[PDB]
Amino acid sequence: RFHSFSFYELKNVTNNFDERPISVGGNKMGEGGFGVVYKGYVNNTTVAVKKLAAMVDITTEELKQQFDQEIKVMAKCQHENLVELLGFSSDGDDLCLVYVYMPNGSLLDRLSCLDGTPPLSWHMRCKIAQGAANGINFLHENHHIHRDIKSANILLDEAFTAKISDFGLARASEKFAQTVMTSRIVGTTAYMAPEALRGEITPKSDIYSFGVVLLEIITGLPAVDEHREPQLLLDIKEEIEDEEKTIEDYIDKKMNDADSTSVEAMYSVASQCLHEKKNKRPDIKKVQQLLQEMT
């Protein structure tokens, strides 16, 4: 399975779970609300220690369910385009998950050049888009639905290889022996398909979200900006679609190596993934093939 670390060992490697940025010499690397991510060192070996945190919205039993489900999926699914779980802690009762460290952060931050990192080139964006599609494919081949595909859950290795993460809300699918419904609607609104916002649970929703990720990649804009018009990135398909706009108007200007042909081809994938009708969307195997034909 995985290694079982003691809470005390993890507390040590993360300097008390020291909450300052690495810049000023602390250990905190990032936060959602699922938990906080800490830079760790065990075996000369740098790691990510995620300490899960209860936040008014989840039971301290629904946060244990995300814990067990992360472990449950990471056991079943090992792939070059998914993060790697090394181990876990459950004693000391913060609950921790330990991964192989991703030195290049999230795609979201790399896209925004957070803390001053350089802008990703078109060349690098293409590899990342293909990597991400590959990770998603493996998941869907293994009858898993992620339920929260977004650039923040796409991590980047020491080679800028894309790795999908955050499996705490993943669900088993099946052959489609019938439309499956939620009473607990989860996901990130700015990346959700309309059926997922109504509570359907289907792999076709991951495809829609991924299509939003492709837009971020092309444009370098986050999916939601309250201080922008349109506030939601997805609204660009319609602008471009109702000729109020050109895709070339929105291509990220912080690249020097884009070409029209591959950018349009990436846009045409994103536009197909973003069908309002779940059944008109390409499947993941189709997205994978088209992104391959792009390069």
Name the binding residues for ATP.
Answer: 29-37, 50, 150-153, 166
Supply the DSSP string of 52-63, one letter for each residue.
E---TTS-TTTH
- Which residue among the candidates 57, 68, 115, 148 is catalytic per the annotation? 148
| 295, amino acid identity | T
Return the residue of 9, 94, 109, 200 that touches ligand T12, per CB under 6 A. 109
Asked if 101 is part of the footprint of ligand T12 (rule: CB under 6 A), the reply reads yes
Return the residue of 21, 33, 92, 103 that touches ligand T12, per CB under 6 A. 103
Asked if 166 is part of the footprint of ligand T12 (rule: CB under 6 A), the reply reads yes
Binding mask 61-100 for ligand T12 (x = CB under 6 A): ----------------------x---------------x-
**Rounded distance, CA 214 to CA 131, Å?**
12
CA 261, 264, 266, 268 torsion: positive or negative? negative
What is the 8-class DSSP label of residue 102?
-
Question: Cβ distance 251 to 263 under 8 Å?
Answer: yes
Return the residue of 165, 173, 205, 271 that touches ligand T12, per CB under 6 A. 165
Asked if 147 is part of the footprint of ligand T12 (rule: CB under 6 A), the reply reads no
**Rounded distance, CA 44 to CA 71, Å?**
24
Using the minimum distance from each CB to ligand T12, give the nearer residue, 71 or 192: 71
Q: How far is the CB of 208 from ligand T12 (least distance, A)?
A: 22
3-state secondary structure of 106: strand
Using the minimum distance from each CB to ligand T12, give the nearer residue, 32 or 200: 32
**Rounded distance, CA 150 to CA 45, Å?**
28
Asked if 230 is part of the footprint of ligand T12 (rule: CB under 6 A), the reply reads no
Asked if 135 is part of the footprint of ligand T12 (rule: CB under 6 A), the reply reads no
Question: Cβ distance 211 to 272 under 8 Å?
Answer: yes
Residue number of the CB closest to ligand T12 reads 105
Asked if 115 is part of the footprint of ligand T12 (rule: CB under 6 A), the reply reads yes
Question: How many CB atoms lie under 10 A from the CB of residue 195?
Answer: 18
Asked if 119 is part of the footprint of ligand T12 (rule: CB under 6 A), the reply reads no
Cβ partners under 8 Å of residue 184, min gap 6? none
* Binding-site size, ligand T12 (CB under 6 A): 19
Q: Which of 49, 30, 63, 45 is nearest to 98 (CA)?
A: 49
Question: How many CB atoms lie under 10 A from the CB of residue 270?
Answer: 24
Asked if 102 is part of the footprint of ligand T12 (rule: CB under 6 A), the reply reads yes
User: Is 225 assigned a catalytic role?
Assistant: no
Q: Which residues in 42-61 contact ligand T12 (CB under 6 A)?
A: 48, 50
Using the minimum distance from each CB to ligand T12, give the nearer residue, 30 or 187: 30
Using the minimum distance from each CB to ligand T12, give the nearer residue, 92 or 103: 103
**Rounded distance, CA 172 to CA 20, Å?**
37
**Rounded distance, CA 193 to CA 212, Å?**
10
Which residues of the chain form contacts with ligand T12 (CB under 6 A)?
A: 29-30, 37, 48, 50, 83, 99, 101-106, 109, 115, 117, 155, 165-166
Active site (catalytic) residues: 148
